[PDB]
Automatic annotation (TrEMBL), chain A:
GO cellular component, one term: cytoplasm
Transmembrane segments: none
Lineage: Bacteria, Bacillati, Cyanobacteriota, Cyanophyceae, Coleofasciculales
Binding site for Ca(2+): 304, 309, 312
Superkingdom, natural source: Bacteria
UniProt keyword annotations, A-Z: Calcium, Metal-binding, Multifunctional enzyme, Phosphopantetheine, Phosphoprotein, Transferase
Name the UniProt record assigns to this protein: CurL
GO process annotations (BP): DIM/DIP cell wall layer assembly; fatty acid biosynthetic process
Organism per entry: Moorena producens 3L
Ketosynthase family 3 (KS3) domain ranges (all copies): 36-460
Part of the full-length chain shown: 3 to 936 of 1956
Single GO molecular function: metal ion binding
Automatic annotation (TrEMBL), chain B:
Domain of life assignment: Bacteria
Name the UniProt record assigns to this protein: CurL
Binding site for Ca(2+): 295, 300, 303
Protein source organism: Moorena producens 3L
Domain Ketosynthase family 3 (KS3): 27-451
Part of the full-length chain shown: 12 to 936 of 1956
Organism phylogeny: Bacteria, Bacillati, Cyanobacteriota, Cyanophyceae, Coleofasciculales
Length: 896, 823
């Protein structure tokens, strides 16, 4: 009674309390989960010594154990004016050698919109950050337009270079000197060019700079200050001054080599380079199906303090920083298999580092199961500000390839290191990175000269249509030519990648620039051939190219819907057997109506009863496909049977309403009597009208269509039609009798006109959304279309197609897409408009495979600037984002 | 026996608490516990800066003749190539001055040491001093260093003059600058140098606040520096049409036509609130929230952006969980640019339009109108200004606002420029403000700052690294003691002994009141030697000396034995709470005196004592418990040798005796009144001095503290000790032999010191009592402590004031002994 109530209340009380407890718990779990969340590395790019211009090239170098160290290039400074190995020499450099980039003056100024004036005072550090970041983003398969105006963070390890001090020597200070040389402007320019609004900073902690930026980026992402982050470092060797300071401070090896862990370690070698990585919180990278290269688990940064010299390393400081980083990501020391050491190859540094590693991993590691150590420094030198980014990248590649690369110069193990009491092993050979199921974890160390130490822990990453359309584009013809070349080498080197996947990635994950190319292909070999054909200039079907003018807009597009005489057996069968947007429309029709499908596509006809509603559906199905790919008509029109589908598209009817009407007239005109003929006459509408008058046949013969200025279709009684044709032939006027059933748009259509006006009366008429050109008028349809009168008058009146075309031409239309099984209206269309005017595109065409016609037309719309829904175009297929070529920068020399 | 609902509501209460606690620490206010600066207008302290701001002083001046020749770079023509638009700027009074020895920088190292590094060291040192951080708590600690700093021209002018040196690196690299702060201050937490242009100082703050909230560090140094070393930058900025030809930031005025370059340095000390309160630190203000962002691609690279500024202010408010309505003041980025000023006010209006009214408006101003655009250090000046505004509960005027800018829709923007020094009137509610800084290249920052929550005998210790600095330090205390008579000497002493580094040149002053201290310091500056004033220059790297504790025996006792210490000193009371009475009584008093000396950081290197004194030296050594230790015929004094008296005992055949050997001509004879009286009469007949009052004839664990035996007279049973003589003279010679020079006597009378001086060479050693009958118990103890401090003994000054209500007060900062270094 009321006992039910006190018990109902008690259940509802608990119910609420459990709901509140669940939600409170969830709220706190989210906070904890977020705080220790791995940060997915989703893209990387670099410029390192030894001609390294990508992670693939860095890995080959690392894999093959190549010494990238060379003599100071004559073009940087004359090493002959500074080299002196004598430790007592004043104002001299200890070494002849360094780790240098292949070029530093080269930059694609127009790509980034930097005027040639501005580039003269632009720090080569900024030039490299722009190229590298762009590529890091491309490689992460993000589109900079969809990245534009976003909450993305920029965290760069960057110090001032000597560029400005080389300008101050020759010229008078200019306004660009500031933006061109400030490290704050360097990072600022990335946010400016890529349109990034998140946190932005330039850090400088010497050798740990690159790793401090990572820590800060990971802080930002966990704290939800951004959703994407660029993290990197730069370091350039522009003047010998810094090399004199480092030689005088006794930091540099007279051998010009980092002989890390070797008995002969006697300082480091100065290298230069640039590395940028793209970061997301792991959950966001899993949600977006990004390829995770590796994950950053934990980071720590600390200081040596008063414990020892300002420029001398400190073992307890290094121990605290590794331990804090392991603590920050919840990694146990036992989980770690590899360390990419700071390993600068100094006499006192090597023992302090290995000793600090021995302190951290001593209880977790054994001499039989040791920790592996090594450094990129033995290949490319010490990149100082950019060391750490190079270290991280090496570790990431090692994780990708499941191999540990060899560390160079390790001949005599250092006697000052107690090898027998430290479970440490120097990687001397390229070896499989073995594990026992256990996920591969590594550490990267960077110990700054002024005592600012940093450490990072990185774990291994977790765990139909047979005709294709490829789009390529660059900001310049030269750049597109270089891009096409990239693809030819790319396709020859990676034949294991699916053309479906390559195409999908290029269309969806790459920028659509003004110098474009569209290629239709069914297999990799065909694609390869067509790219070669285009390069040689061999004008071949399925390959379209154009340079759109700068700041150009998508043109207006006219949709022309086909008429009665267009049908054939199995028309667009392939799209039914292969295209879901088309099928969800063609089957939806079939439900309204033997079956539409058995008539259209039999197991194994031209009669108006079938003929009329079929085309409507087929055209609605084709229109459903085109809008799915992002095509939206600016005006519509159709030859009688096609004005039905043109009207449903603009709103006038529902698929059901419109398809009921077309099935009605089809069934109606079929039961109508014989003796009905239609003739195609090559003569003006006036010439035919004067002959109708002359022969007194005006009440027995009608003009069915005006399709051209000298191309008209006559309709009426068999004898009368034959009489006018015979007379027209007598006048040398060409005539063609149509394989028609009944005399359409002729007086003979009067009996049915009431039984069909009955059907039209039982229909709701909604106003049109898109512009429609009337068949009855040859002008823009007004409010006239609303009343079922317009549709009854439609059967009786001649089809003014010629005027419909001139209307479109007067409105400035030059792009026409035919939605139908044959390019009929295109042929008639080309005849109405002046020669060579407009672009005419079919949907279906006999002799051309359905997908082949649809894609050749799509590529041609993409040449006009029509924004294609490329996501939409590959939605119903099993596509995966793959690695594809990055942008081919058109480099030019800027200095002085 | 709980129902499902009861259990759930219990589990729910806990879950809610766990969530509230976590959410609280994530948005925890960060306390500002000290600041220092060097700003234009001779500003060298937050106090001098507040006078500049208070009195609406304009600190702009022409470029100093010793910086660069302005006449060679100035051209009025705004079409002039390679010239400076103005001849003015906000300059520092001196930039070449630095106390290199204080910092341990050689003169060769200082020649190439970037002035930015010089200011950073001085400024950080003062910030920590003002925050009253205990030296031992700062050295070898998890403290972060977050500084806004970009490279200066210093090395460019070095390169024109010499061959590159090793020092050029560490003397000019911005990482080296922040690195050195950690090196000198002994800091092990995160360290970084940020460069985001005009927003660097605010970005460094945000980073520091994050680090503190993330528990990466427990204290942090945050700030920035900017210096105008060469004309080159001023040329670039003039060519870029950024600089006012008037040489003034006419913020919000109609004539606004650019900014004026300034220079300066600011460092602030940060702590999470819960820690600042727990440690009783003086909270100047709290940092509620911070946010850093970018313009992106919206406007031009060097042009500001309103929407970016709206996003950043809103983020800083959200981050701190602050309602826009709570904000009463904004320290505007306001650089005085033509397009910048409308954008800025527009953006303020957008964030605060629906919360502020024309009747009740938001107040805006900028320190740039007083000192110029300090650029990298711009954010630190703005913050310091707002902090000073919250402290003094007033809004300082903003200069050059004559004609309100017609491009600003003042009639719709509920924004008001501060024109006069006004009382910061809040309607009961807490005072909250925000500081904006928008970097020239788009990096924006905004910070939200809120008002801060809510025995009579003394020993002052003063110290400096040099004699000149200690006099300068004493001089500053003299001036300070006059200007603030409102300050209790107890608190002044407390702060100076606990919150200041103890250096080589030192001074100890015992005084009972403010008047006594002022006078004694005046007497010291004259050289008028008076009791209770100690002074010494301890040598460079001189360790704490060996202290030998001496405990008295029978005879020293009196009726009012340490009564002043029994009542006023609680450590003495704790330990406390005729031969049958006096023997454990002297032990009782010597235990209480020792415990009290030990609570001041005193620990002996050796222990010993006369008769009862040996038993008390034993408990101290740890040879037996206090519980175990305490639980347990005429004598004549002879003025003759131990040998000279023993030969007479054989001659008179009186053998069956010497009680104690207190010297080579001072011995004690024990025996029967007839036997001893016969010696005394014979010894007086031989012309040997003799006197006497004793009502009788006298004479577990291992030791952790070295002990000199009375029996052996050397290092080291209790039954034999009673029989055998007390070899005091032998015990003193071994102390002398083992290099002992510092002697502390624990007892009621300084008996053993007089006895000890007679056993050692002329003027050798320092002799210290505990109690002296004529002298007051506090006076004798404090004068002895002052002498232990002079010797180098690490005194536990916090234990010295542990039982008295002592509060940290604003005390003076180090007088840097400046010298000129350049090239
Ligand atoms: Ca160090
Ligand atoms: Ca901007």
């Amino acid at each position: 009674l009321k006992q039910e109530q006190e018990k109902e209340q008690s259940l509802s009380a608990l119910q609420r309390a459990l709901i509140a407890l669940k939600d409170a718990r969830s709220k706190l779990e989210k906070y904890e989960t977020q705080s220790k969340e791995p940060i997915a590395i989703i893209g990387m790019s670099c410029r390192f010594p030894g001609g390294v211009d990508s992670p693939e090239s860095f890995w080959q170098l690392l894999n093959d154990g190549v010494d990238a160290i060379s003599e100071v290039p004559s073009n940087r400074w004359n090493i002959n004016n500074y080299y002196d190995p004598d430790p007592d020499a004043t104002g001299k450099i200890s070494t002849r050698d360094g780790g240098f980039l292949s070029q530093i003056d080269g930059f694609d100024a127009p790509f980034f919109c930097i005027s040639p004036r501005e580039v003269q005072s632009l720090d080569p550090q900024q030039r490299l950050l722009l190229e590298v970041s762009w590529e890091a983003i491309e490689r992460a398969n993000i589109v900079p337009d969809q990245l534009f105006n976003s909450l993305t963070g920029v965290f760069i390890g960057i110090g001032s270079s000597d560029y400005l001090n080389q300008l101050a020597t020759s010229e008078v200070p200019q306004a660009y000197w500031g933006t061109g040389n400030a490290p704050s402007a360097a990072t600022g320019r990335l946010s400016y060019i890529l349109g990034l609004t998140g946190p932005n900073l330039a850090v400088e902690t010497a050798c740990s700079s690159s790793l401090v930026s990572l820590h800060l980026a990971c802080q930002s992402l966990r704290q939800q200050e951004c959703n994407l982050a660029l993290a990197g470092g730069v370091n350039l060797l522009l003047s010998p001054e810094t090399s004199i300071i480092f030689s005088q401070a006794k930091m540099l090896s007279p051998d010009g080599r980092c002989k890390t862990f070797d008995a002969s370690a006697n300082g480091y070698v100065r290298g230069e380079g640039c590395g940028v990585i793209v970061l997301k919180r792991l959950s966001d990278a899993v949600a977006n199906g990004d390829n995770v290269l590796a994950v950053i688990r934990g980071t720590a940064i600390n200081q040596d303090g008063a414990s020892g010299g300002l420029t001398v390393p400190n073992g307890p400081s290094q121990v605290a920083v590794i331990r804090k980083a392991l603590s920050n990501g919840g990694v146990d020391p036992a989980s770690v298999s590899y360390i990419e050491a700071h390993g600068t190859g100094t006499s006192l540094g090597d023992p302090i580092e290995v000793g600090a590693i021995g302190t951290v991993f001593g209880k977790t590691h054994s001499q039989e199961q040791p920790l592996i150590v090594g450094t990129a420094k033995t290949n490319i030198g010490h990149l100082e500000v950019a060391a750490g980014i190079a270290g991280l990248m090496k570790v990431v590649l090692q994780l990708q390839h499941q191999q540990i690369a060899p560390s160079l110069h390790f001949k005599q193990p250092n006697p000052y290191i107690n090898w027998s009491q430290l479970p440490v092993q120097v990687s001397t050979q390229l070896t499989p990175w073995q594990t026992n199921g256990k996920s591969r974890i590594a550490g990267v160390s960077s110990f700054g000269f002024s005592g600012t130490n940093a450490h990072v822990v990185i774990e291994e990453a977790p765990k139909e249509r047979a005709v294709y359309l490829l789009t390529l584009s660059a900001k310049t013809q030269a750049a597109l030519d270089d891009l096409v070349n990239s693809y030819q080498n790319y396709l020859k080197n990676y034949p294991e990648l699916r053309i479906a996947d390559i195409c999908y990635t290029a269309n969806t994950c790459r920028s659509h620039f003004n110098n474009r190319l569209a290629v239709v292909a069914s297999n990799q070999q065909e694609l390869v051939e067509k790219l070669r054909q285009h390069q040689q200039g061999e004008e071949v079907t399925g390959i379209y190219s154009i340079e759109l003018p700068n700041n150009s807009t998508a043109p207006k597009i006219a949709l022309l819907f086909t008429g009665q005489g267009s049908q054939y057996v199995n028309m667009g069968r392939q799209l039914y057997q292969q295209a879901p947007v088309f099928r969800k429309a063609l089957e939806q029709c079939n439900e309204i109506l033997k079956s539409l499908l058995e008539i259209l596509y039999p197991a194994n006809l031209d009669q108006t009863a079938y003929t009329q509603p079929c085309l409507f559906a087929l055209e609605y199905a084709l229109f459903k496909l085109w809008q799915s790919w992002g095509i939206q008509p600016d005006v519509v029109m159709g030859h009688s049977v096609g004005e039905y589908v043109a009207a449903t598209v603009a709103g006038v009817f529902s698929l059901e309403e419109g398809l009921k009407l077309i099935a009605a007239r089809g069934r109606l005109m079929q039961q109508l009597p014989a003796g009905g003929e239609m003739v195609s006459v090559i003569a003006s509408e006036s010439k035919v009208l004067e002959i109708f008058k002359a022969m007194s046949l005006e009440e027995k013969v009608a003009i069915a269509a005006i399709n051209g200025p000298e191309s008209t279709v006559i309709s009426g009684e068999a004898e009368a039609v034959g009489a006018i044709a015979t007379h027209l032939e007598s006048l040398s006027i060409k005539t063609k009798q149509l394989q028609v059933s009944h005399a359409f748009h002729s007086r003979l259509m009067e009996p049915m006109l009431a039984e069909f006006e009955a059907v039209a009366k039982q229909v709701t008429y909604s106003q049109p959304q898109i512009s429609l050109i009337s068949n009855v008028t040859g002008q823009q349809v007004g409010s006239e279309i609303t009343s079922a009168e317009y549709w009854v008058n439609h059967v009786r009146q001649p089809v003014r197609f010629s005027e419909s075309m001139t209307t479109l031409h007067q409105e400035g239309y030059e792009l026409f897409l035919e939605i139908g099984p044959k390019p009929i209206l295109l042929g008639m269309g080309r005849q109405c408009l002046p020669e060579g005017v407009g672009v005419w595109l079919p949907s279906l065409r006999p002799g051309v495979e359905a997908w082949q016609q649809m894609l050749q037309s799509l590529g041609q719309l993409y040449m006009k600037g029509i924004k294609v829904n490329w996501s939409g175009f590959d939605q119903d297929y099993a596509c995966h984002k793959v690695a594809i070529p990055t942008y081919p920068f058109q480099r030019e020399s800027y200095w002085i």
